[PDB]
Amino acid sequence: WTGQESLSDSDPEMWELLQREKDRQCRGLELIASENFCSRAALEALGSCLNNKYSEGYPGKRYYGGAEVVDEIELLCQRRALEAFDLDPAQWGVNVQPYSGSPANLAVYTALLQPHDRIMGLDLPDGGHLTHGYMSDVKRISATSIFFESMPYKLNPKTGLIDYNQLALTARLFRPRLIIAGTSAYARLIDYARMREVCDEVKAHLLADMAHISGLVAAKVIPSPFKHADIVTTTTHKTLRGARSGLIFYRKGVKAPKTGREIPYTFEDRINFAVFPSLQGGPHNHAIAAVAVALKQACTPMFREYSLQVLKNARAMADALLERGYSLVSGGTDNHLVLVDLRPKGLDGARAERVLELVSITANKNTCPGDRSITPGGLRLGAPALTSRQFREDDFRRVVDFIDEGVNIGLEVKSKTAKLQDFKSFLLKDSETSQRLANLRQRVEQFARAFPMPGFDEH
Amino acid sequence: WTGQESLSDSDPEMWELLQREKDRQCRGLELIASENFCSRAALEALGSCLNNKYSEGYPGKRYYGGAEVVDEIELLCQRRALEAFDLDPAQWGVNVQPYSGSPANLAVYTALLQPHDRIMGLDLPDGGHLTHGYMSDVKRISATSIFFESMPYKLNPKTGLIDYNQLALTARLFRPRLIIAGTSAYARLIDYARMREVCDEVKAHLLADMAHISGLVAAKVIPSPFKHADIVTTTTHKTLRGARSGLIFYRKGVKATGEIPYTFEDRINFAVFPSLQGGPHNHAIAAVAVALKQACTPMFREYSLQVLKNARAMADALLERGYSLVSGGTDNHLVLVDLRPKGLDGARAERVLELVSITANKNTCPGDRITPGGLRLGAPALTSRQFREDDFRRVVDFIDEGVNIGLEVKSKTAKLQDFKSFLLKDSETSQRLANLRQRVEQFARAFPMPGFDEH
Amino acid sequence: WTGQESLSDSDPEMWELLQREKDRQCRGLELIASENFCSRAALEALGSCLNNKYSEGYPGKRYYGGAEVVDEIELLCQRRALEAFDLDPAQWGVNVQPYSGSPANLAVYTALLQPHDRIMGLDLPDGGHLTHGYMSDVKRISATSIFFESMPYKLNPKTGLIDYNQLALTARLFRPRLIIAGTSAYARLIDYARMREVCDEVKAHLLADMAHISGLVAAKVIPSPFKHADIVTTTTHKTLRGARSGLIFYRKGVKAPKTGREIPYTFEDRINFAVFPSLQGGPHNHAIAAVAVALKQACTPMFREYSLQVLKNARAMADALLERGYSLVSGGTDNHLVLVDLRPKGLDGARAERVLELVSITANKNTCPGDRSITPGGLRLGAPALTSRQFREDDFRRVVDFIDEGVNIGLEVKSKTAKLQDFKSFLLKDSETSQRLANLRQRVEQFARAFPMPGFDEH
Amino acid sequence: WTGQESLSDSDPEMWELLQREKDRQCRGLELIASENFCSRAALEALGSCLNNKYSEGYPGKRYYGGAEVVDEIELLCQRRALEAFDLDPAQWGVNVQPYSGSPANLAVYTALLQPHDRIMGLDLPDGGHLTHGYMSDVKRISATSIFFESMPYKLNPKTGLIDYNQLALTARLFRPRLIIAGTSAYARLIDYARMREVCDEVKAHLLADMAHISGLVAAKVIPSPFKHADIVTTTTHKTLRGARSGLIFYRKGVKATGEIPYTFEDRINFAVFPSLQGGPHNHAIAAVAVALKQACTPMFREYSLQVLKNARAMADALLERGYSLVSGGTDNHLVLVDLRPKGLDGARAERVLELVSITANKNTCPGDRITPGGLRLGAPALTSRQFREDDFRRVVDFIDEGVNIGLEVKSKTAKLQDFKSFLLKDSETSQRLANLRQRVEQFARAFPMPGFDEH
Ligand SMILES: Nc1nc2ccn(CCCCc3ccc(C(=O)O)c(F)c3)c2c(=O)[nH]1
Ligand SMILES: Nc1nc2ccn(CCCCc3ccc(C(=O)O)c(F)c3)c2c(=O)[nH]1
Ligand SMILES: Cc1ncc(COP(=O)(O)O)c(CNCC(=O)O)c1O
Ligand SMILES: Cc1ncc(COP(=O)(O)O)c(CNCC(=O)O)c1O
Ligand SMILES: Cc1ncc(COP(=O)(O)O)c(CNCC(=O)O)c1O
Ligand SMILES: Cc1ncc(COP(=O)(O)O)c(CNCC(=O)O)c1O
């Protein structure tokens, strides 16, 4: 035994699963707005010897020795991160050690806030993420709501865009220490200048979690939150199309004074201390390297053309079913995802997702503003995944037809069934649907296989 | 742009940095006790298309859809995790989603304890890890000391072993809700039975963090903490020789008028997600599953047996050459060397050994508060390169030459950065270290290296 | 030395101060809404041998011995408390050990809530009290806001009455565990049925702090909060006209169930444990006795006539200066105090209070809804103090004339000065005012001395 | 209705209850160590018109108006408070607004510590007070254990004294921010210097809670904790013989490149008001000021001297009659009697002594966890009734008869409530206790009683 044996020779039971997952990725259509297909150059670094190196600390200030090479890789990842988002290395710094998106936000809270300090984020059913501070009415769900006190800001159930009105008044009542301007299911843009002026009034930190729109900000397509926020966290996958990791961007340098006083930003040393030694242990240098590869790809003109494509098909998604029997919350989209309101078409979110999944269309249910209730009303459909397969507008309008067909299968089964347990049932029971779904899935798998796919060929 | 371009073509700047680290690992003597060389089979899974799948939730209980095979992969990782440690699936469950060892420990605290509940682990300078609750006398350092109240227990400096007596004394006063049994720098076997009795007396959960000794535990070469702990966490690298990830083993079934069940499973799984983490790193979960099957093989038992032999051979070689060992020797994978009787501190030795491609780390000795005067040396990394007992005896020879080089420089320097700069500016000390480094690399390059050939 | 020597014989320096304070009490007019003049029967018990007894615990469940007599005094205080507010001793219990009003509320929070649990109270500048959870924008002021997380509910700056609208929406955002329906500077009534229905929606405890309107609820004049709240705290002075102490009323017995289930209230054992042994030590049995005396006086027809008088002069206060050059927030009063808005008369709160004090009219500045800012706009004027001196409507309309004269002295000095340091200055500097105030104070002291005064004659 | 009616006329039900307690105090032997008989002069101030004045704030810094003389009264109480303890007004300030001793301690924690900061006091069964942080093994009992994290230090059971060594050992591990020096049941003098060194080492505030010994400290008959503590709290009753209220003494001026000042004054005063309390009990503040001037007199020094003599006379009388004393004897105002060697527990003795008008309280002995087997007896209450050494020797005689009555009943009963009921139902034990009670009351009534005659 040497450890250099191939995976296909040593673990065939596993190797069959990697290929089965790779096949299904190429089999169907990925419409989850948070998913994407990583490049072979990044995964080549992800599965490298950099997994073997323990490099606790930071470049130049390690605790072990022998970090000569990983120090240059971390510094290059930092330079490529500041370059990808057009940041002066004197006005901004970046921490590339967060294991994923969730640890990145928890590190920002630990660095700048005390336990049980106040936090305001967009609620989870209103398009927010768990790590933005989510409690139900029974249990504290996210750990961000256990170690800190979180009050959600909602948004106008008629506008579809976040209620910067109600956020302003309640920020003066709740008196938060930090407000998160980030979204997980929101098809429009964020007024970060509005978010900064409410934060400056109640004196709260404005943290931007551009996790979903990271690649779009990098390609300078949509307005960048770095002009208004002081701290920016993000995912390294999603639109950035990299390995699973996180990044914490923080403002650095002099912020502002009598006739003689320099008043510097204090984010850097606190943020870096929260990541290590407070929260995380040994960095995942293989992930940091894979992120640096994906960040370099984000500085290229290819990535701007890819980013400019995720919107035009997001609009093509919005136009294709607005010109069908569907309405969209907020009234379309200005980013990468569409929030199709299946309520005015007599459908629910849990209904369509199970149907679309069985025909190899991966989606997820979303709670639209006028949804009520487990059976939400709306679906979450994204662009960046198929756009990385060289999908164009005509290709996305055809998927909408594949979706519309799947919806009208569910809408036909729903009127022939009752509850959700009977609906998700009859999707696999009724023989009239047992091969109507198979006939569809057949047409859907052949349409999807013909497109290219980033990464390795067989895994 | 297809996204299928190779790394050497697409990003030549990063491809070379990859190969530079590969050469550094192949040419150096990796003695960091927490480092190992992951197999190529696992790395193939680590850098696969499983990075692309968002599967928030658990097998069968996924929030989204399309996780058909990812559910099979995570379930396979769990089955191999319990098999690797001879665990009854009816008495033990495992969470395979912790991003690393530090998240695994934070998930256990968030699941079982309320904020500011009390935690007891071995003090960091005494051999405990950061995530076992560590505060300095000036600052709360570990987040385990911010969200929870930690009080450390200490070694008996006379013997270098854990002071199980003083732990029992202070646990009755501190009344902790959870006590951590697990070390980062400890050459001896933890008395898990004694820890269990202390936890039973003060009504505390016993958490075993076997991150450093997990591979040894899986190979049944040292006593298993599963026979005494309710919760067991571990890293998946180190002696398990896998990708970087975490595991949380917990008790299941009935604990003990009349059926008091265990209440760990769903609290632990809820703390991992949705409380603390987001999407699981399915590529890491798969690479861990590949490593876990390797841990069930007879090959891994003989390797773990060799790790113990190599550590003792390294320990015996140091003793015969006039070195002091904390706690007198070792019973696991690492060796704690006390360099104070030889005349050099761990800081100076760590820098000298690093410049000759020998990677160790300074280690606090019982007594010092002070610059560290010890050194922690591990066997599992080089043992994966087919090192044997005679090879580690030769490693101690290279270490002994490095110590005396640092000894002669200390006599020619005052402050520590005068010492560090003297190893670079001074022309002799430069070439004297260049000859030792070359002899070290020629000796290390000859041994095989797990993983890919080029990166 | 025996300890039985008189105070006038053993401590003449002190004895002179007791008489000086007694003289000034009879000298001037007490218009502080929270103050009152205690009866001689209560103070006789307040300065008794009951100060010597340590009786930690509760009747029947003491920790020491020899509590045979104080147990009957505590039980009688409990019976007289439930009788004074017409409570079924099966539906309500009372804890008579709170040292004062502030400890009473802190005990309720400790009993029912966890540290950093959420609390909603009326803000201090909006008429609330400190113990209702008051933070500034720099420091956490009240300890209730340090050990618990408090978000204030404000009230319509045009209505004058608490904004049950904004309280309802923010209670669904803040998700509090307990909401306090109590006031310190609020001239109108509280819709406790509105307060209960918002508490039932967000599932929060409704605590009523009737500290200011305790005597009015006891005399069954104004609506009682005990019909809507589960926990009621109060002061034993203020309108109850007793010694300084506090009381915690809690609901007791079965609250509600399948076909067989009794679901009891759990307030009693928690509330009693928070008072002792959690927060307080040895009870002040001399205060408990003095409270029981004052509570028995509250069950009498005399107290209803006294209570019915505190409002008619509160209205007479409201009418007298509404029919002068003054406006009142909320538009008058329905309880015992008036909140005179001195803004539309060109006056401030800090201006009039210092002027009225120097002529022996004790008042306090209050922040009216349209006040801005240290120099608030409005004054807090109460009835129960002088009403206990057998004051009637014609007597209160004359004080308003004494007030109006004092205001027009300040309004004349304010136009002759500038800031507050110069205003409070020229009140004692200008000789035209140095005896205009002395001539007034002379007429004010003779008008006030002629009225009776509860308590001892000389101290 | 004028409000000037007497209590005997207005409320005859309460007036009689007042006189019933007065007779119980005059006829009983008050041995509760924390009880004293307040003078009539102070009670006149306690039940005065100062109950009517709301003066939220501090002298000169009042939020309202009309506190002209109340400011003079509070300032006079402060001047007498520092004079009573020989304190330089430039080095010490005092807050006279704490409603009692428990609020005084909570105000110190709220002022100096953040929520969940760490507190160390002597354990309750070992002689510490509730407000020094007390949790059982099942529940946080004291609010000082809810808003802050308390860990107790313990007596050395071999000697009955505070284990200053183990306190130093556990303070280094627990790292408390404030350590409390002060007891409720402790017959010996606290080593405030040793407490100070432990606090200086772990960077903790030393809080001295002298509630039980304040009168002795004021009379300079025992060492003053002000020579070693930064914060000193006390009740105003007990040995100070005043009304029920609290005091917080704190350091002022300069504490120690170059003028590091003390930072207690405004933090302490802010915690009292507006943080914790509302309107001060000016009637209590005045009654306290009357008592504080009494504490500065030569009369109070001779009374405090007699308190020590009476406690030793009580202690010696118990020893000669075959009783055991925790820590061998006493150096202050109380005596801790161990009744386990005699064959009776404190619970049974406390009930028997109560039925014969002898008021003591059961007290845990070092070792027991168990029903208490000891008894705490205090001297300051009866010493205020002009009791002398021979009178306390007679008190021990009455106690000795009560113990043997309880001993014979224990031999005729099984459970504890069988014992308690036997003292009431059984006709002999009833009349045997009636004869002792009558002899106790005839002996006690003869001594003078401070306060009013009738109430
Ligand atoms: N025994 C043991 N050894 C090692 C070697 C690496 N690590 C974790 C990395 C050390 C980080 C650190 C160490 C000490 C301090 C301090 O402030 O003194 C600190 F602020 C941060 C450990 C460990 O956690 N424990
Ligand atoms: N040494 C000392 N003696 C006395 C005598 C009275 N008090 C305070 C009243 C005791 C309340 C108490 C005591 C014990 C427990 C327990 O749970 O064991 C409890 F839940 C409540 C004290 C004191 O605080 N300390
Ligand atoms: C016992 C123990 N537990 C948890 C962790 C955290 O695991 P990650 O670093 O993978 O998060 C470590 C890291 N090991 C520290 C060392 O090198 O000694 C550890 O040694
Ligand atoms: C806005 C946002 N922020 C943070 C995270 C956390 O990232 P990790 O799960 O990699 O830790 C997510 C994941 N969101 C998943 C989804 O929307 O489907 C996210 O959408
Ligand atoms: C040392 C000490 N500190 C504070 C307090 C609290 O004081 P109040 O009870 O006045 O709040 C007490 C009460 N004494 C308890 C006993 O009888 O032993 C005490 O003994
Ligand atoms: C509504 C209310 N509640 C509680 C308290 C506290 O009571 P003590 O101060 O007796 O603890 C006050 C005192 N309020 C004083 C004022 O309004 O002037 C109050 O007005």
Side-chain angles (χ1 to χ4, degrees), chain C residues 34 100-103 129 183-184 209 211-212 235 237-238 380, chain D residues 54 56 64 99 278-279:
Chain C
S34 61
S100 203
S102 294
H129 194 251
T183 62
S184 204
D209 184 34
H212 255 269
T235 313
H237 36 288
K238 302 203 182 74
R380 204 169 149 262
Chain D
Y54 257 114
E56 292 169 294
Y64 293 10
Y99 295 147

Short mmCIF file of all heavy atoms in Angstrom, two decimals, chain C residues 34 100-103 129 183-184 209 211-212 235 237-238 380, chain D residues 54 56 64 99 278-279, ligand 6:
data_model
loop_
_atom_site.label_atom_id
_atom_site.label_comp_id
_atom_site.label_asym_id
_atom_site.label_seq_id
_atom_site.Cartn_x
_atom_site.Cartn_y
_atom_site.Cartn_z
N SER C 34 -46.04 61.14 42.04
CA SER C 34 -45.65 59.91 42.73
C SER C 34 -45.60 60.06 44.24
O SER C 34 -45.50 59.05 44.94
CB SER C 34 -44.29 59.44 42.22
OG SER C 34 -43.29 60.41 42.48
N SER C 100 -39.39 47.75 47.36
CA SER C 100 -39.97 48.95 46.77
C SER C 100 -40.54 48.58 45.40
O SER C 100 -40.72 47.40 45.10
CB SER C 100 -38.93 50.08 46.70
OG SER C 100 -39.55 51.35 46.65
N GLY C 101 -40.82 49.60 44.58
CA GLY C 101 -41.40 49.33 43.27
C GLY C 101 -40.40 48.72 42.31
O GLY C 101 -40.69 47.73 41.63
N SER C 102 -39.20 49.29 42.24
CA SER C 102 -38.17 48.75 41.35
C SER C 102 -37.84 47.29 41.64
O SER C 102 -37.81 46.50 40.69
CB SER C 102 -36.91 49.64 41.42
OG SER C 102 -37.17 50.93 40.90
N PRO C 103 -37.60 46.87 42.89
CA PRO C 103 -37.37 45.43 43.12
C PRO C 103 -38.54 44.55 42.74
O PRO C 103 -38.34 43.39 42.36
CB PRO C 103 -37.08 45.36 44.63
CG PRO C 103 -36.63 46.72 45.00
CD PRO C 103 -37.43 47.64 44.13
N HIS C 129 -41.22 54.16 32.93
CA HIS C 129 -40.30 54.15 34.05
C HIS C 129 -39.01 53.43 33.68
O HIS C 129 -38.96 52.67 32.71
CB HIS C 129 -40.94 53.49 35.28
CG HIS C 129 -40.20 53.74 36.55
ND1 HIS C 129 -39.49 52.75 37.20
CD2 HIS C 129 -40.04 54.86 37.29
CE1 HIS C 129 -38.93 53.25 38.29
NE2 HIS C 129 -39.25 54.53 38.36
N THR C 183 -47.27 52.96 33.47
CA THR C 183 -46.87 54.32 33.11
C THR C 183 -46.30 55.05 34.32
O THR C 183 -46.61 54.73 35.47
CB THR C 183 -48.05 55.13 32.55
OG1 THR C 183 -49.07 55.25 33.55
CG2 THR C 183 -48.62 54.46 31.31
N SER C 184 -45.45 56.03 34.03
CA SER C 184 -44.92 56.95 35.02
C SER C 184 -45.30 58.40 34.76
O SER C 184 -45.36 59.19 35.70
CB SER C 184 -43.39 56.84 35.09
OG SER C 184 -42.89 57.27 36.34
N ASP C 209 -48.00 47.39 35.67
CA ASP C 209 -47.33 48.12 36.75
C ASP C 209 -48.19 49.32 37.10
O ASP C 209 -47.92 50.46 36.72
CB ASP C 209 -45.91 48.51 36.33
CG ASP C 209 -45.14 49.18 37.45
OD1 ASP C 209 -45.34 48.80 38.62
OD2 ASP C 209 -44.32 50.07 37.15
N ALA C 211 -48.36 51.07 39.44
CA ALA C 211 -47.73 51.77 40.55
C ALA C 211 -48.32 53.16 40.75
O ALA C 211 -48.54 53.59 41.89
CB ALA C 211 -46.22 51.87 40.30
N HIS C 212 -48.62 53.86 39.66
CA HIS C 212 -49.11 55.22 39.79
C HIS C 212 -50.60 55.29 40.04
O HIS C 212 -51.08 56.27 40.62
CB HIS C 212 -48.76 56.02 38.53
CG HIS C 212 -47.63 56.97 38.74
ND1 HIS C 212 -47.83 58.28 39.13
CD2 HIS C 212 -46.29 56.80 38.65
CE1 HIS C 212 -46.66 58.88 39.26
NE2 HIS C 212 -45.71 58.00 38.97
N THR C 235 -46.54 50.00 43.46
CA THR C 235 -45.99 50.69 44.61
C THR C 235 -47.01 50.69 45.75
O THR C 235 -48.22 50.73 45.52
CB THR C 235 -45.64 52.13 44.23
OG1 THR C 235 -44.90 52.13 43.01
CG2 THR C 235 -44.79 52.73 45.28
N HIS C 237 -46.70 53.13 48.12
CA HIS C 237 -47.00 54.55 48.28
C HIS C 237 -47.68 55.06 47.02
O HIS C 237 -48.47 54.33 46.41
CB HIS C 237 -45.74 55.38 48.59
CG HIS C 237 -44.49 54.91 47.91
ND1 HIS C 237 -43.83 53.75 48.28
CD2 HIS C 237 -43.75 55.47 46.93
CE1 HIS C 237 -42.75 53.61 47.53
NE2 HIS C 237 -42.68 54.63 46.70
N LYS C 238 -47.38 56.30 46.61
CA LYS C 238 -48.06 56.97 45.50
C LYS C 238 -49.53 57.08 45.88
O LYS C 238 -49.83 57.64 46.94
CB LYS C 238 -47.76 56.24 44.18
CG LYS C 238 -46.28 56.14 43.83
CD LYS C 238 -46.11 55.95 42.33
CE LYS C 238 -44.64 55.80 41.96
NZ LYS C 238 -44.10 54.47 42.34
N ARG C 380 -44.85 67.88 35.01
CA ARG C 380 -45.60 66.75 35.56
C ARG C 380 -46.24 67.20 36.87
O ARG C 380 -45.54 67.48 37.84
CB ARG C 380 -44.68 65.56 35.76
CG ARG C 380 -45.35 64.20 35.77
CD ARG C 380 -44.28 63.14 35.71
NE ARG C 380 -44.64 61.91 36.39
CZ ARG C 380 -44.25 61.61 37.63
NH1 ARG C 380 -43.52 62.47 38.32
NH2 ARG C 380 -44.60 60.47 38.17
N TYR D 54 -39.87 61.68 47.65
CA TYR D 54 -39.18 61.05 46.53
C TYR D 54 -37.97 61.89 46.17
O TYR D 54 -38.12 63.06 45.79
CB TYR D 54 -40.12 60.91 45.32
CG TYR D 54 -40.67 59.52 45.11
CD1 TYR D 54 -42.03 59.27 45.24
CD2 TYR D 54 -39.84 58.47 44.75
CE1 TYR D 54 -42.54 58.00 45.04
CE2 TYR D 54 -40.34 57.20 44.55
CZ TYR D 54 -41.69 56.97 44.70
OH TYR D 54 -42.19 55.70 44.50
N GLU D 56 -35.13 60.72 44.03
CA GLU D 56 -34.33 59.92 43.10
C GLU D 56 -33.13 60.73 42.62
O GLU D 56 -33.28 61.85 42.14
CB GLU D 56 -35.18 59.46 41.92
CG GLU D 56 -36.25 58.44 42.30
CD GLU D 56 -37.25 58.18 41.19
OE1 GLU D 56 -38.01 59.12 40.84
OE2 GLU D 56 -37.27 57.05 40.66
N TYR D 64 -35.36 65.54 40.58
CA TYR D 64 -36.52 66.37 40.84
C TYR D 64 -36.09 67.55 41.72
O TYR D 64 -34.91 67.95 41.68
CB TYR D 64 -37.63 65.51 41.45
CG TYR D 64 -38.22 64.46 40.53
CD1 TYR D 64 -37.64 64.16 39.30
CD2 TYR D 64 -39.37 63.76 40.89
CE1 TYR D 64 -38.17 63.20 38.46
CE2 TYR D 64 -39.91 62.80 40.05
CZ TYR D 64 -39.30 62.53 38.84
OH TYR D 64 -39.84 61.57 38.00
N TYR D 99 -31.43 49.42 49.71
CA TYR D 99 -32.59 49.10 50.52
C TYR D 99 -32.26 48.10 51.62
O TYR D 99 -32.85 48.16 52.71
CB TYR D 99 -33.71 48.54 49.64
CG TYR D 99 -34.26 49.53 48.63
CD1 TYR D 99 -34.72 49.10 47.40
CD2 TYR D 99 -34.32 50.88 48.92
CE1 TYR D 99 -35.23 49.99 46.48
CE2 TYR D 99 -34.83 51.79 48.01
CZ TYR D 99 -35.28 51.34 46.78
OH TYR D 99 -35.79 52.23 45.87
N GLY D 278 -35.05 52.60 42.79
CA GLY D 278 -35.77 53.81 42.47
C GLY D 278 -35.57 54.87 43.54
O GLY D 278 -34.44 55.27 43.83
N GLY D 279 -36.67 55.31 44.15
CA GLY D 279 -36.60 56.29 45.21
C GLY D 279 -35.98 55.73 46.46
O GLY D 279 -36.32 54.63 46.92
C1 LIG E 6 -44.60 53.36 37.50
C2 LIG E 6 -43.50 53.17 38.51
N1 LIG E 6 -43.04 51.92 38.78
C3 LIG E 6 -42.06 51.68 39.67
C4 LIG E 6 -41.44 52.68 40.40
C5 LIG E 6 -40.34 52.34 41.38
O1 LIG E 6 -40.75 52.52 42.73
P1 LIG E 6 -39.61 52.80 43.83
O2 LIG E 6 -38.90 54.03 43.30
O3 LIG E 6 -40.35 53.01 45.13
O4 LIG E 6 -38.78 51.54 43.77
C6 LIG E 6 -41.86 54.09 40.20
C7 LIG E 6 -41.21 55.23 40.95
N2 LIG E 6 -41.42 56.45 40.19
C8 LIG E 6 -40.97 57.72 40.72
C9 LIG E 6 -41.59 58.87 39.96
O5 LIG E 6 -42.36 58.61 39.00
O6 LIG E 6 -41.32 60.04 40.32
C10 LIG E 6 -42.93 54.34 39.21
O7 LIG E 6 -43.38 55.61 38.96
#
